[PDB]
Amino acid sequence: KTCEHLADTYRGVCFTNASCDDHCKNKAHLISGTCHNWKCFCTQNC
Numbered sequence: 001k002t003c004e005h006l007a008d009t010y011r012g013v014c015f016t017n018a019s020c021d022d023h024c025k026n027k028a029h030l031i032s033g034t035c036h037n038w039k040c041f042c043t044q045n046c
Contacts, residue, residue, distance in 0.1 A: 003046040007033075010040045 007027045014020065014035035024033025024042035033042035 001046070002043065004041045004043055006036070006039050006041045012038075014038050014040065 005028070007023065009027055010023055011019065017034055020033040020035050020040035020042070023040050024030055028042050028044075030042045030044050033040055035041075
């Protein structure tokens with residue numbers, strides 16, 4: 001299975017799927033990250 005985590009160092013609100021991706025990649029060097037409930041979650045294998 002895979003576990004996702006929401007980063008506390010985001011920009012508050014989300015506008016486009018790219019906001020989390022860049023964010024995740026730059027914040028938590030992982031594969032990808034999307035917007036959930038205006039928040040950002042990253043993808044991490046575990």
